[PDB]
Each structure stands twice: as C-alpha cells, then as structure tokens.
C-alpha cells in the first residue's frame, strides 16, 4: 500500500509518479488515466491518493481532500510556507477562510464540531507562517 500527493489532472511522469509505486508492482499507465479520471471533478488542486496493490499487482486507490498546508497556501494566495514559521509570517487568511478549509477537509478530519475542525486547520496554518484575521 503506497500513498502520494498527485496533482488533479496529471500523472505518468517518471520522477513524480513512475519509480515510486512503479517499484511495488503497480502498472503506471492504468493509474495515470484512472487517477486523472475522477480527479477531473476537482482539477487544479493537489490531492493525496492512497494506492493499494494486491499480491496480483492489481490495485485500487482512495482519493482524499487536498492537504491543509496546500489549501492554506492557496487561500493566503502564496506559493510557499514561511521558511521560519511564527518567526516570519509570509501570508494570512480570514477566520472565515479557516472555516472554508475546515469544511472542505471535514471528510478527512476527525473533529466532532466545525469549531474543532477549524482549530485543526489553524494548527497547520500556525506551522507554515500563515496568520488568521
């Protein structure tokens, strides 16, 4: 069982994909087209998928919501997180934005309340030099 974060509508490259699971038994081509199939509904974003390979080299994979750090980057309109979180703020997002992301990632979050969800997201923002306003 392998896991990785592949961009929406794109796959097959050797450096990014290939070698990775391609060395566990997986047949790249089938995944590239397959992944890029459903990753059509949500394109442009980087989404993490969990590939599972059965003894017979066959496989399946679940597509999850994009990473918090990623959504956060997007929200703050930045490209990278601070090189020194807290010491240097490189961006910021509104409390409502935290709410949006928390809502977006909810299926993958284990919070029992939207409040707890936002607290989770804020923890990530605090780790990448992104402030909340």
């Amino acid at each position: 069982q392998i896991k990785l974060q592949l961009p929406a509508g794109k796959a097959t490259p050797a450096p990014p994909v290939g070698p990775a699971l391609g060395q566990h038994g997986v047949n790249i081509m089938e995944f590239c087209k397959r992944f890029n199939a459903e990753t059509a509904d949500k394109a442009g974003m980087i989404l993490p998928v969990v590939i599972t390979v059965y003894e017979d080299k066959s496989f399946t994979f679940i597509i999850k919501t994009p990473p918090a750090s990623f959504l956060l980057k997007k929200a703050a309109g930045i490209e990278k997180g601070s090189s020194e979180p807290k010491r240097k703020i490189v961006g910021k997002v509104t409390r409502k934005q935290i709410e949006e992301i928390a809502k977006t990632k909810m299926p993958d979050l284990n919070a029992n309340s939207l409040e707890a969800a936002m607290k989770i997201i804020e923890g990530t923002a605090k780790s990448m030099g992104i402030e909340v306003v």
């Binding site: 450096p15 290939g18 070698p19 990775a20 060395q23």
Partner: peptide, 17 residues
Amino acid sequence: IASASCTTXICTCSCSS
C-alpha cells in the same frame, strides 16, 4: 544525480537485487 533505487525526483530508484 545518478544511482540505482535511490532518489525522489530525477529518475532512478531501484530495480533489482
């Protein structure tokens, strides 16, 4: 920049043993 089995971003990795 080269090897067999051993990196994440250029292209080698592994492949026997």
